[PDB]
Amino acid sequence: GEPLYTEQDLAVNGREGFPNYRIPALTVTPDGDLLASYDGRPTGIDAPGPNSILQRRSTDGGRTWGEQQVVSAGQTTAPIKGFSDPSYLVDRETGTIFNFHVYSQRQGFAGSRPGTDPADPNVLHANVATSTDGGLTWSHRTITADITPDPGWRSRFAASGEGIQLRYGPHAGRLIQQYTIINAAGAFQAVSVYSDDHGRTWRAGEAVGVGMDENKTVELSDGRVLLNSRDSARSGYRKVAVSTDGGHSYGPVTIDRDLPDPTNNASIIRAFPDAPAGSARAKVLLFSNAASQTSRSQGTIRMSCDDGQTWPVSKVFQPGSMSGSTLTALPDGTYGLLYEPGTGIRYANFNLAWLGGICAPFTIPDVALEPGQQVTVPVAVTNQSGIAVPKPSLQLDASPDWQVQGSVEPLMPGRQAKGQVTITVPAGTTPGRYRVGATLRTSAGNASTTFTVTVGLLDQARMSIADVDSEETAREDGRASNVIDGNPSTFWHTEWSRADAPGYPHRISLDLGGTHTISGLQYTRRQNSANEQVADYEIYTSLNGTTWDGPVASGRFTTSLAPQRAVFPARDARYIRLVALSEQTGHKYAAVAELEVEGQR
Ligand SMILES: CC(=O)N[C@H]1[C@H]([C@H](O)[C@H](O)CO)O[C@](O)(C(=O)O)C[C@@H]1O
Ligand code: NA
After folding, report:
1. What pairs make up the disulfide bonds?
2. Residue 102 near residue 158 (C-beta atoms within 8 A)
3. Does residue 476 share a domain with residue 540?
4. Which atom of ligand 1 is nearest to the CA of 22?
5. Residues 590 and 562 in one domain
């Protein structure tokens, strides 16, 4: 295990006949050839851009690549046709290879109309190309009618990247390709499309979830099928669900907080696809996405050793731009990684020695303290490695003027290990919530986690709305309580859905749950609208809840998206009130995403 990481460009925007290349799919043929597929985009856009599905082949394990060839050719003139968003699926029992993609004419995903007739240009069709000669030549089929059991499903696309064939269970041999559909209610849902006859016929299973999008599946160590999805509702994380029936139907969808995502595609595969059911090796998954929540950047590989329950292991492969990626397992024990660096489509090859992980997921809880204080938090390491590590270390990534150190007891096979982290925060430090990184470093590899240190802010969990002048709840979720949920994506909104609703001034008052020394209020505006922004304000406080002292602070907030501080000399108070005197440009309504209170718990 000498570490290996290499890359090379396969398509470069503005070279070889297209101004833009995106949307990677990668597989290994029954004869060991690597196939890389992707869009060529004549007008640089998603469907219904007149796109082509392209393919390059490597016959030497990915070292060198042959000519760019056209699998499905778009038409830029009469009539306009596009083929976009490839996904490979190899039937390893028959040798047959499929490449799923859209067939667009007038409409893409958003515009597609109900119907399944291949001649209808108002439908985004579902196509599949089939090859029986290792991807040299292809025949083409439209399968929309076959995969549309509900005439309310007006639009669909196969998730680009690579589908799977089940190896375990009563449904062994089944081919599974994930799609996103839009139903008659307008929701985006995930669904598995599958074949039990080696691609002769395809059908849709039961749709799952809401706020879904491009999504992927993988067969777990016990033969359940794990679904991992882009979140069209923009949580900043991946969504997950599990099937016990070979991908036909799924349970409840949940967010996976250990998988940050900027709302984009990602890949998940078995590290050991031939490992037997129930084995340790069968539990190992690899994952690729952009780890940034704020841009398509910080492309990262992660590894789970427990069927995707935890993700102890991570390493950055692309610190810069990284706007799509797909993983495949190579015959030589390494992994291919076909991704978008911003320059087109790039092929990378890495091994597990490069990734450098140990299967030892660990936890550190979130902690609160005051500036000028120290606190110690416990560490719990679950050793899934099966080996002893006599001298593990813990390395923390925190503000450079803080003092942070930690330690962990030796790792033992099959056991939990304990540790600790002490944090000292200097006097004066600005109140806020501070993310802190932690890396378990061992001779056998590394694992990591993160936790939040809250400094100088009261506990929102003890706070409640004492009073508010107005709130919208009829047409949207504008609850006053939204200010104290720690989420900048949810907001208090004053009532707007009745004409008689009040205009300015507005007012929101918090019960802190108890009397505290306080010295500040932090305000965060509504993030996705500019027309209900607080401008002029006064802050008042109360020891007993009806008699208000103040203004203790006044001013005019800005249009900054970040927390804005209104500070005041320290005073004891059970209640704090924000009077919103005015809106930035005189609109009627007030919205606030967050309020936090600077004080001593
Ligand atoms: C058929 C189609 O439109 N595919 C496009 C998808 C969807 O539009 C989407 O995920 C729907 O919400 O978006 C991309 O992944 C994207 O965000 O860059 C590009 C991809 O080509
Ligand atoms: Na909020």
Report:
1. none
2. yes
3. yes
4. 21
5. yes
